[PDB]
Amino acid sequence: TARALREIIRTARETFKLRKGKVGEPGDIGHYAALLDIGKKYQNPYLAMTTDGVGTKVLVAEAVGKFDTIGIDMIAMNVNDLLCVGAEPLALVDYFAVKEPNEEVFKQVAKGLYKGAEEAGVAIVGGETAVMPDLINGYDLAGTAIGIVEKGKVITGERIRPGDSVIGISSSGIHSNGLTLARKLLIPKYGLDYEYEGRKLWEWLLEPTRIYVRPILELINSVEVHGLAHITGGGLLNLKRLTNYGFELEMPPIEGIFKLIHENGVPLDEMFRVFNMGVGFIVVVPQEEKEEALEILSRHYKSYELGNVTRELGKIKVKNYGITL
């Protein structure tokens, strides 16, 4: 157990230098709890806290025997959520509930934790490993991330108004939602090795979740932002968390694993409420800032002018697919 944990512990320590000299630097003293130096850079700060797991994507990792990217998924889900209040991610703790202390599994998990932490700019400051074979049939990974945002700079969605521009940033793929549906629909029929548009089914299902920290932090530092939505459970329904105004959108072509799922009988109205459908993060900006917002985001990832916020209330119209959510 401790021997398996050594790989995670040593990797976590290597991420401390990501917050060296910055807000959130780990104190690295004492025991039982991690310490983060809040500092005085932020005059009147709010602390932002999120909690997110990977989901049954970890069952795909276990099936194929490739565990070196689920740490990226866990970190991505948490830090991408933190962005949605306008916070800069600082640090993360992991909850790792496992059926056995398999040292090879833990070593691989640590590799992805390090890569995800590097990309998100966060230190992994502690966590808990619970070996519970009676309770866990596999390797469950979740976490809690902490960020910081100035009072007065919190982005809630309250400033969203009709006419605002809606911009989508491409996902890397399926990310970490809808895997239960995808696993049940596709794996018995096709097999994990099935080749679809140049990639095996398991590669489509295990593609690591994209991390949006760098584009979004650059965006909020450069333009006024009215809303930020990480596209997770519920798909486009997450936009309704930001505002009661409506949306009229043109969504990107249905491609990759989403096309295969649709071709296996899942209707589009359901797909847009389950899968990210190619858009992993959506920003809402005053229409005056649309061009500059799209240019900042496009420097990092393929991004899309999706549409507008509408005076019509509550509805999400995906116009090029004839769908209303």
Place this chain on the structure above:
Amino acid sequence: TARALREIIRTARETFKLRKGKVGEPGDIGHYAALLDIGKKYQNPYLAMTTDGVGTKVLVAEAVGKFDTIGIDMIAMNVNDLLCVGAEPLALVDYFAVKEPNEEVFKQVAKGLYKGAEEAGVAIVGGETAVMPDLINGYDLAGTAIGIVEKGKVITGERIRPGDSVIGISSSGIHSNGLTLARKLLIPKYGLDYEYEGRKLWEWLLEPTRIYVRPILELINSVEVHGLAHITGGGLLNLKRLTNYGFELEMPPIEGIFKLIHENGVPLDEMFRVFNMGVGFIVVVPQEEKEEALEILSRHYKSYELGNVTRELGKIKVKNYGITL
């Protein structure tokens, strides 16, 4: 799933008044992340973060169908850990991984979460519920607690010196560690209804973990404290996390569930490395403060003068049981 989650969300919203006006008050704005007001009460603050779970105690809860105390266990484990750096607990998020969105189970879990939050003085500000029947055989409950400690007031263990007094605070019972051993040893032999000293075996195994926030916060604000150890996994071995110095201890009588376990053949040296054996929390203070520390702690719970820190580096001698760990 939304029906079942409503039970916990409603209860968590009711805990917000526990931090109303105090440091750590939650903000009623935003989504995706919880927001905590750090305030001006602290001049140079460290943010303290812990992650801890209930363990397979939740399998006893599921066996008997009584879930309204495992939330106390989860909150207690986290806030008791936070105390060990000298931090005042502020807020908590829960990670709830379940085999199904059972509304009666969630309703019961919420009751214990509320009771634990009230006893610990923390707000429950968010969390994740993950419905994953292929991965979770039961209802797994864990969480992360956040607290605050002034930079100069961190209790590190660095100040522990030979001659320091070692004081134990009684546990409420088995707490949340050693349940795998207790379940495997006792349940098939005796049955959950087996009556021992007036309590059924499941009542012994499910007894909620004690919360030490009140005595420890009073202690640190009154006397010089050199070390604080919540007795969790590893039992007395947790004392070795605080210092390289040794310990000479007299442990309390073996009673209750620990006596039944001992009489079923578990050796005492193993027992002191697995179970809390009646001592849930240990403090280390200068010898001159021993009587004051005992008086403060004894206002709240039965407490023990256990012994002294020794120059015998790295050893824990339990001399009244002839044991060295």
